[PDB]
Amino acid sequence: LRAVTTHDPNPAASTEQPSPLGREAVEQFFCHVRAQLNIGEYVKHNVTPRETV
């Protein structure tokens, strides 16, 4: 809401700037959709494959 607040009514002189909501949400939480995409990356996050030879 601070990214859409204006300081002037003229559309060509508007002070509103692009909003970070969706990009930030996708960057942090919706970036782990690949983990649940037939990859097994959720396992890779906490795999600890202890195979002693």
Binding site: H32, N46, V47, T48, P49, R50, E51
Partner: protein, 50 residues
Amino acid sequence: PACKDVPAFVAAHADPRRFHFHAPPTSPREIRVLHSLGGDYVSFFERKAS
């Protein structure tokens, strides 16, 4: 789909070793013991929510 011995496969379900937790493994050079994997309550949803 590409089983080269069907009769063996059928007469493999009757061998108790095929369905026992600690059965004898069916000349071993090397052996790799997977004795630890992932933990518990470590889900990304759970760790993010916490």
